[PDB]
Design a protein around this ligand. Structure first.
Ligand SMILES: CC1(C)Cc2cc(Cl)ccc2C(N[C@@H](Cc2ccccc2)c2nc(=O)c3cnccc3[nH]2)=N1
Ligand SMILES: [Zn+2]
Ligand SMILES: [Zn+2]
Ligand SMILES: [Zn+2]
Length: 390
């Protein structure tokens, strides 16, 4: 796992990528690690923000599946042609596998200026793969074709350059301190988990806990922010405003639309509260908490103008598709995606962004006598209901 330590790079707010090779002879590309989707897709035609891309004509091992795929996002899209080719991870396991690859032939708002990834590695499950769940995701081919154990772990360390580690097939004990706590993968589609309680500086938000998981909660390395369902987000902002009320920020700040600044090195970190999300434990009635510092959810943005000011963006935002535990949360922790045991572990990261008097933490157990089920059951559409899964 020493070969895999430090195999991630990225830019702040543009995710983390790992090198991969596609084709023979191998074409090296920088690929976004995305635990919130399930396609392996690579830029495969010229684009003004890419200077390399997968050229299927140069790969003697490439085979066309003769099927297109179209992937809309709320903010953009990619589309392309499905095929298979040999794939390896130069700073990962010593193996090569034959994987599905979507060659992206057109896209809109997907490849960003001065972003240096040329593709996306969807690490989530077949159920959310496009065009449907019969396109086997990369990690499933990896595991089926080799002896790599069915698990990977991410150490995401906090435009400024960022680094981290994806350990494929293992847990590297040098990347965390202290205890490793597991929460169940509630269902294998996204990496879905259940939050049972939320506290802001030790004060319970006191919502029905189903609200925390409406309509799901997921661990997502392809999302920058901590995103929270609307009602949860409003209660959180109310509570963070109350703690920081010595400072009156504009509304655009709370929307993530405006930076706020203090004189160099003077930021009053101590007026911003910690946030603790309690995740359901492997034992009924148990939970454990992960505790986020302001230094994780206030993200520094280097000011081209005001020179000796430290300026920050608020990186908690609204969601209408459940809680999203993005970079803001993952950057505190070493996150173990234990697919074999259908669970996600959290430990304090060996690279966490500390504070004078407080630390990102993973702590448990907390027991409740309270039964309550905090999971939300998504209303089943007639479209979902009809599809056969043979
Ligand atoms: C995986 C990936 C590329 C999928 C994606 C597709 C498109 Cl078309 C536009 C943006 C994104 C995207 N957005 C992330 C930020 C990002 C961009 C590039 C690489 C990694 C992460 C995101 N995070 C938020 O917190 C967020 C919050 N609100 C709205 C949209 C948001 N979008 N992530
Ligand atoms: Zn480059
Ligand atoms: Zn059938
Ligand atoms: Zn199916």
């Amino acid at each position: 796992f020493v070969e895999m330590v430090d195999n991630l790079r990225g830019k702040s707010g543009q995710g983390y990528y790992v090198e991969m090779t596609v084709g023979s002879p191998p074409q090296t590309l920088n690929i976004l690690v995305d635990t919130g989707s399930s396609n392996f897709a690579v830029g495969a035609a010229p684009h003004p923000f890419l200077h390399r891309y997968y050229q299927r004509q140069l790969s003697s091992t490439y085979r066309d599946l003769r099927k297109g795929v179209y992937v809309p996002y709320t903010q953009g899209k990619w589309e392309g042609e499905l095929g298979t080719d040999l794939v390896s991870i130069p700073h990962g396991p010593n193996v090569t596998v034959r994987a599905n690859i979507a060659a992206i032939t057109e896209s809109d708002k997907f490849f960003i200026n001065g972003s240096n990834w040329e593709g996306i590695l969807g690490l989530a499950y077949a159920e959310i793969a496009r065009p449907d769940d019969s396109l086997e995701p990369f990690f499933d081919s990896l595991v089926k074709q080799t002896h790599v154990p069915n698990l990977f772990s991410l150490q995401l360390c906090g435009l400024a350059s960022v680094g981290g580690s994806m350990i494929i097939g293992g847990i590297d004990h040098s990347l965390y301190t202290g205890s490793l706590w597991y929460t169940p993968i509630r269902r294998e589609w996204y990496y879905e988990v259940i939050i049972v309680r939320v506290e802001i500086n030790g004060q319970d938000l006191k919502m029905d806990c189903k609200e925390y998981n409406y309509d799901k909660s997921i661990v997502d390395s392809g999302t920058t922010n901590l995103r929270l369902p609307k009602k949860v987000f409003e209660a959180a902002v109310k509570s963070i405003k109350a703690a920081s009320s010595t400072e009156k920020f504009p509304d655009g700040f709370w929307l993530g639309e405006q930076l706020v600044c203090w004189q160099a090195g003077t930021t009053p970190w101590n007026i911003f509260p910690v946030i603790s999300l309690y995740l359901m434990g492997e034992v009924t009635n148990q939970s454990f908490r992960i505790t986020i510092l302001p230094q994780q959810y206030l993200r520094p943005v280097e000011d081209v103008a005001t020179s000796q000011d430290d300026c920050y963006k608020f990186a908690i935002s609204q969601s209408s598709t459940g809680t999203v535990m993005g970079a803001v949360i993952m950057e505190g922790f070493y996150v173990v995606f234990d697919r074999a045991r259908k669970r996600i572990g959290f430990a304090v990261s060996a690279c966490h962004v500390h504070d004078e008097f407080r630390t990102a933490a993973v702590e448990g157990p907390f027991v409740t006598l309270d039964m309550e089920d905090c999971g939300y059951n998504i209303p089943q559409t007639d479209e979902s209901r009809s599809h056969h899964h043979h």
